[PDB]
Design a protein around this ligand. Structure first.
Ligand SMILES: Nc1ncnc2c1ncn2[C@@H]1O[C@H](COP(=O)(O)OP(=O)(O)NP(=O)(O)O)[C@@H](O)[C@H]1O
Ligand SMILES: Nc1ncnc2c1ncn2[C@@H]1O[C@H](COP(=O)(O)OP(=O)(O)NP(=O)(O)O)[C@@H](O)[C@H]1O
Ligand SMILES: [Mg+2]
Ligand SMILES: [Mg+2]
Ligand SMILES: [Mg+2]
Lengths: 577, 577
């Protein structure tokens, strides 16, 4: 009631008047309360941050399995908050807002279920928003619409008026997914692909499942295996993949890349639509690709590449313009340093030189003269002595056959288990890694340059003061709120110049890190980044550290490996050993 | 004079009266004049478009070799306007402006010399700009600063007060530079790389040459050749590449991607620093890569990929989400139909399946294997259609029997090893229709649109609600180029009915297209795109087709092939045969 009357009150009057609202809290409905987090300078300044608060109607016991909030499995708290976001957002598609100024920015959820700062379940329901409040004169009627006519009905009908059965099933599917990824290394696998999974996406620029003429994934028998889901009781069946080397071989339009992308997202749980639901991978899995002109600092790529020009150091690599082989190797070590157990390779984004060696090529120029020691030679070593496994798509090269654990053959989106035939083909055709990695972070040479503000640019980049970090090929980033999280971390690392050691220890301390779902090889770089991640988790995916330029509640969880990767490619980065 | 005397008058007054400034044209100095092409609505709005006019002081005789404007070689006209802007911009680093509002937006030219609408030479000098005229009570003093203090000294000192000896030398390098490529197909070559060239760049995110410890290009003797530049008299020497197949072989970190990138830009002339200056390629050459999830419509990918799943037609291919080989082959023909003469490949960003087939792969599963690799179509394409290929190969000597020359690179030093290489092979040892039927269908193509077309940086096109991915069309090298493409799309759309057949004709008529420097296999698609390019050229890089959201003078020339690639991968592209 009173907010409106207030606005009538200030309806004509000048814009400055608005700075009164901030902090000033009003109840706009019986079941809705509004709290003002900021009030911006003008209409065109991006949003005026507000906290929408409304009662939590559903039974915790039925959906969260406990009466007291604090006991609830965080996974289910996430799936809940995730769901509410989804429901509120769908409210626009169901013509619920009697009016749609469209000046209401609230973070849009991916197809993946991540903890987001956006909705918090507290004891109530906490939804953060950004609103473009309506000439120089104020125009209260605009706002008046915006709250009473657009937000209240959406809240009351899609948020307060939730559907419990839907909620409960959301949460059950999600949780069963987490648990099912928690069962992986135990059950004997590194990846599991559920039967009937609709892997292929809707469009090359789309993440939703394929509506038309999808072919449900079917595991070969020899690779078939089953599980029991705890919360649904549903028992499911599919393709299990042992530790070691999984080869995905077929030449054509067959589905190879499509399966693999499923596996990269395999570290996520997605809304029951997604159709990749219950395709799961080790939660530390990393899409490994050549990436070029990326900068490297302090990575020891010496396992793969041996003989740089001009006696330049393999063992502590450093460039601001990297090669396809060198940076791919850079990414493999970058990864191991952050502790990945399952590398994911799509050969078409991989640096052929790294991958294998041609006879003609070696005889043309002697391999003594060639630096590179290809991946095939390091792979058996990595699985046997390190428990690091690889799944990779190979297009037309059987060189990997003596090393291959399984050889898959994809044809028109159908798989066959051809591991026997292939190693038979191989047949008739016939460690090196330091886990304790000496890499500390140097905030001095790293941050000397800058002049600030830190902010996430879409899904692609980080505005880091005058600097700009390119994540366009950190392919497992799948939300804007993720890169935003990363921005929070960077602005933190920057702001407190006690923290590197402090976070390094904060990290060495931990036994398990948070998955982006909420559920819980070393070095000081690694461990530090773990410290940052962990601290961020602590403060509810919202560090506020001063140099950060971010709205309240547009942040999504992300693995520590991603914060790793983002710093890892700061091109002002400096690092010591 | 009069402008400021106006402004203070206004300075209390409301922003609106700035709508008086429209059209009204003022002289803020002897050698300066400004014309207001627009006025922003708001202080925020991206700026207010103005024409900056100043006298042409230099002797046209020495620089353009004619007293009369209209005779001037457009190559030297471009190099002129290029140089003018460049100095103007340099005016900021030389402490020239008295004040620095930074409300002045004027296109930043790249290292490339391109025709740009920004500076025009007419009879004088024409520079287009965008200004943010500053509380929302007018900031008359602020504006006064922008013009009396910032723009004028820049103009008078760096533009009116230009340096003719440099400008002359600019133009000589540029012109001599264009001529050197015109000489290429004649002199018997497809690529020429000048000795002493500095190929590599300062940083993975930078286009400027490698300042520190660059190693100068040197041609192997066997491939060495020389030319004579008409305008400088200078005689230059380097690496000549014949028609046919050139293989770039090597190990790692030796500079192949460096050389190749130089060759991709080889369709451009660079400001005399750039250091790739006098590296030239066929001005039609295209960087061919696997581009995944790109949409295809109407491409006959048949020569490489003869089979698909489900009787899907290779001969008229269509996907909204695409494969590495499938996309790459689309690219090869997309480019062929637009008339490429040299295909440029980095075996790394190429889809390997398209490139060779392993013995082991072929046996494990027989080829009766959609794909027919490039190695087989290469001789054919060369011999029968005069389309050549230079490609970086990482470790596969399979191409050796097909190889014209085999280049071996080692620590930034090339060697001719084609003898030894083909021996290696010896020791271990048409299809394409030029007449491709592809008409453009504006009906199905433009149905879903409500508009506005605007280029997003260098990377994408906001085509109404649609978005086009130019992120892997690697030879786009300016924002003004993407803006150009946006102009053309806005044209095909707004002038929809008669513009397709008309441009098709307007393009069949043409025996030469305009190179981006200004100097001057068929299908209706192609001929149409050529029509668009040529009409754009005619119209001075300013087609204000009505649905174009663009400031005046933020446009740069492109090849026709580029406009081809953008339309080509529109996700609502419908095309008929
Ligand atoms: N199981 C499926 N059902 C329906 N469509 C599919 C399926 N799998 C893949 N697709 C579509 O097939 C197209 C090509 O599949 P893709 O995943 O690229 O095969 P691929 O092996 O990567 N070929 P390549 O990378 O060229 O060697 C993509 O558009 C997919 O969306
Ligand atoms: N003339 C030069 N002077 C100095 N540095 C150079 C020169 N040419 C190349 N480089 C460096 O080498 C890198 C490019 O070479 P690169 O692409 O690694 O060769 P490559 O071995 O063919 N690639 P790959 O085989 O895929 O690893 C750049 O990052 C440059 O820094
Ligand atoms: Mg390279
Ligand atoms: Mg390379
Ligand atoms: Mg693919």
């Amino acid at each position: 009631s009173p907010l409106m009357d207030f606005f009538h009150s200030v309806e004509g009057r000048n814009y400055g008047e608005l700075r009164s609202l901030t902090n000033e809290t009003y109840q706009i409905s019986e079941n809705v309360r509004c709290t003002f987090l900021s009030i911006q300078s003008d209409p065109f300044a991006p949003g005026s941050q507000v906290r929408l608060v409304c009662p939590c109607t559903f039974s915790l016991e039925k959906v969260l399995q406990t009466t007291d909030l604090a006991a609830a499995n965080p996974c289910r708290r996430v799936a809940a908050e995730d769901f509410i976001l989804r429901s509120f957002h769908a409210g626009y598609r169901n013509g619920i807002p009697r009016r749609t100024s469209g000046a209401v920015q609230v973070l849009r959820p991916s197809q993946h279920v991540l903890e987001r700062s956006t909705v918090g379940l507290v004891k109530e329901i906490e939804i953060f928003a950004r609103v473009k409040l309506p000439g120089r004169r104020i125009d209260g009627h605009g706002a008046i619409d915006i709250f009473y006519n657009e937000l209240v009905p959406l809240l009351e009908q899609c948020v307060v008026g939730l559907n419990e059965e839907d909620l409960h099933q959301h949460v059950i599917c999600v949780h069963d997914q987490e648990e099912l990824r928690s069962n992986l290394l135990g059950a004997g696998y590194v990846a599991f692909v559920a039967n009937g999974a609709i892997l292929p996406r809707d469009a090359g620029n789309s993440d939703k499942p394929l509506r038309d003429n999808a072919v449900p994934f079917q595991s070969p028998k020899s690779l078939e295996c089953s599980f029991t889901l705890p919360h649904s009781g549903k028992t499911i069946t599919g393709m299990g993949l042992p530790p070691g080397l999984t080869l995905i071989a077929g030449g054509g339009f067959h589905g190879k890349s499509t399966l693999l992308r499923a596996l990269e997202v395999g570290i996520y749980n997605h809304v029951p639509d997604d159709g990749r639901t219950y395709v799961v991978v080790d939660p530390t899995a990393v899409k490994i690709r050549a990436e070029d002109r990326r900068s490297v600092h302090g990575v020891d790529i010496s396992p793969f590449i041996n003989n740089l020009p001009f006696g330049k150091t393999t063992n502590f690599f450093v460039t601001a313009d990297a090669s396809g082989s060198t940076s791919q190797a850079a990414n493999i070590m970058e990864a191991l340093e952050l502790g990945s157990q399952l590398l994911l390779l799509d050969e078409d984004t991989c640096a052929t030189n790294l991958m294998y060696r041609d006879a003609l090529m070696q005889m043309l120029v002697p391999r003594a003269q060639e630096p590179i020691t290809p991946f095939v030679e390091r792979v058996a070593d990595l699985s046997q002595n390190h428990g690091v496994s690889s799944i990779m798509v190979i297009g037309g090269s059987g060189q990997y056959f003596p090393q291959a654990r399984v050889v898959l053959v994809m044809n028109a989106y159908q798989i066959s288990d051809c591991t026997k035939e292939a190693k038979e083909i191989a047949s008739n055709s016939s460690s090196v890694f330091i886990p304790d990695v000496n890499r500390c972070f140097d905030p001095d040479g790293s941050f000397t340059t800058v002049r600030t503000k830190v902010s996430g640019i879409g899904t692609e980049s980080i505005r880091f003061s005058e600097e700009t970090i390119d994540l366009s090929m950190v392919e497992q980033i799948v939300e804007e709120g993720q890169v935003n999280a990363i921005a929070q971390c960077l602005a933190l690392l920057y702001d407190g110049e006690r923290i590197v050691p402090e976070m390094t220890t904060k990290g060495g301390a931990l036994t398990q890190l948070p998955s982006p779902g909420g559920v819980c090889f070393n070095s000081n770089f690694s461990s530090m980044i773990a410290g940052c991640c962990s601290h961020q988790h602590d403060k509810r995916l919202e560090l506020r550290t001063p140099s950060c330029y971010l709205p309240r509640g547009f942040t999504s969880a992300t693995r520590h490996i991603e914060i790793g990767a983002a710093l890892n490619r700061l091109r002002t980065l400096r690092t010591v050993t």
